[PDB]
Design a protein around this ligand. Structure first.
Ligand SMILES: Cc1cc2nc3c(=O)[nH]c(=O)nc-3n(C[C@H](O)[C@H](O)[C@H](O)COP(=O)(O)OP(=O)(O)OC[C@H]3O[C@@H](n4cnc5c(N)ncnc54)[C@H](O)[C@@H]3O)c2cc1C
Ligand SMILES: NC(=O)c1ccc[n+]([C@@H]2O[C@H](COP(=O)([O-])OP(=O)(O)OC[C@H]3O[C@@H](n4cnc5c(N)ncnc54)[C@H](OP(=O)(O)O)[C@@H]3O)[C@@H](O)[C@H]2O)c1
Ligand SMILES: [Mg+2]
Length: 309
């Protein structure tokens, strides 16, 4: 049932790779495919991009690639564009199970005049649209990989991993979960609990939903999956249903799991964290506990993993 992956020597490295390529001399990779992940009612396009790096830019799950879009620095004429980082959405073996490709999950950044709604492409995001406009065979300047915060702790193969995502923040967790449930990795047999919370605008904006629902069916005792559809569901107080409200619904069992040593991960909108904090704070305090002190402990114990942007 698990998918054969190759080559097994990608397991050999003792330490994550870091900054194998830097902006001064990037790696010229090649697009394999680009597809929309969303339906017509989504507020914007998010695309899945598969990139052939030829085995020249390996990474571990949870890392990022940098992309240098073409053109010159608009601020610094006679200079290349700055790097944009993207969370890698694939396992180290990639979507072709062969160790040659990695994938990105990219939301197009588009500008709309606040009053008239007139879109203005001159104010669109350069790199996000460059990527989702890409076609098979196009060349892309890759840097990295980078990142350590979102590496998956594998010391306990029966650990609990609580994953909190908004939008493209799902990307690392797609990689985690394929490694946990889909790929045949003899040196990592996951037997714990993986719990994905995902916040997106509506049903049409769901990302990789089919893949996650399949894990629910295959591994009902090791995978849980909750969704906050902000524009189709209301929280208990009449506002938009956000991931922190879903967390609140399970506040007692999330705290027990954290108390038990669970890892908790946050990726996506930086603006979600104050509400998640608020929500975790209330639970700690009703128990008689300082959240300030508890959060400090969770970080000291290396249980708290944040990459928001
Ligand atoms: C660690 C990390 C991981 C990340 N992972 C992901 C990911 O998985 N997926 C993802 O989609 N993004 C991710 N990002 C964000 C990503 O790096 C980019 O910042 C994002 O794609 C936008 O870059 P851009 O080049 O498209 O926009 P930019 O060209 O950098 O422009 C930024 C914004 O300014 C707006 N803008 C430009 N000109 C004007 C103007 N005149 N008036 C008004 N507005 C203007 C653009 O519309 C855009 O929204 C991540 C960021 C970090 C730090
Ligand atoms: C691109 O990059 C940015 C992010 O795009 P994306 O597709 O990854 O995400 P996104 O569609 O902007 O947001 C993903 C989910 O997070 C929700 N959200 C907004 N504010 C939140 C908050 N404070 N706390 C918790 N959830 C919140 C959003 O709901 P709502 O949009 O309904 O508020 C949405 O359901 C875009 O603005 C564009 O530049
Ligand atoms: Mg869909």
């Amino acid at each position: 049932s698990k998918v054969s992956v190759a080559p097994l020597h990608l397991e050999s490295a003792k330490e994550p790779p870091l900054n194998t390529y830097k902006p001064k001399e990037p790696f010229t990779a090649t697009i394999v495919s680009v597809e929309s992940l969303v339906g017509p009612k989504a507020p914007g396009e998010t695309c899945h991009i598969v990139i052939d790096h030829g085995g020249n830019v390996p990474y571990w799950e949870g890392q990022s690639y940098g992309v240098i879009p073409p053109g010159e620095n608009p601020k610094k004429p006679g200079a290349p564009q700055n790097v944009r980082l993207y969370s890698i959405a694939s396992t180290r073996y990639g979507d072709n199970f062969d160790g040659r490709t990695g994938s990105l999950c990219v939301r197009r950044a588009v500008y709309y005049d606040p009053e008239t709604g007139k879109e203005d492409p001159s104010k669109n995001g350069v790199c996000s649209n460059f990527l989702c406009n890409s076609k098979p065979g196009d060349k892309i300047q890759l840097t990295g990989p980078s990142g350590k915060i979102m590496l998956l702790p594998e010391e306990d193969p029966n650990a609990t991993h609580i994953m909190i995502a908004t939008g493209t923040g799902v990307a690392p967790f797609r990689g985690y979960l394929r490694r946990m449930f889909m790929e045949d990795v003899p040196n990592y047999r996951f037997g714990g609990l993986a719990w994905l919370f995902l916040g997106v605008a509506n049903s049409d904006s769901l990302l990789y939903d089919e893949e996650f629902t399949s894990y629910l069916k295959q591994y009902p005792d090791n995978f849980r999956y909750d969704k906050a559809l902000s524009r189709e569901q209301k929280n208990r107080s009449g506002g938009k249903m956000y991931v922190q409200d879903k967390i609140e619904e399970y506040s007692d069992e999330i705290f027990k799991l954290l108390d038990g040593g669970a890892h908790i991960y946050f990726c996506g909108l930086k603006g979600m964290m104050p509400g998640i904090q608020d929500t975790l704070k209330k639970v700690a305090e009703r128990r008689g506990e300082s959240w300030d002190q508890k959060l400090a402990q969770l970080k000291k114990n290396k249980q708290w993993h944040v990459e928001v942007f």
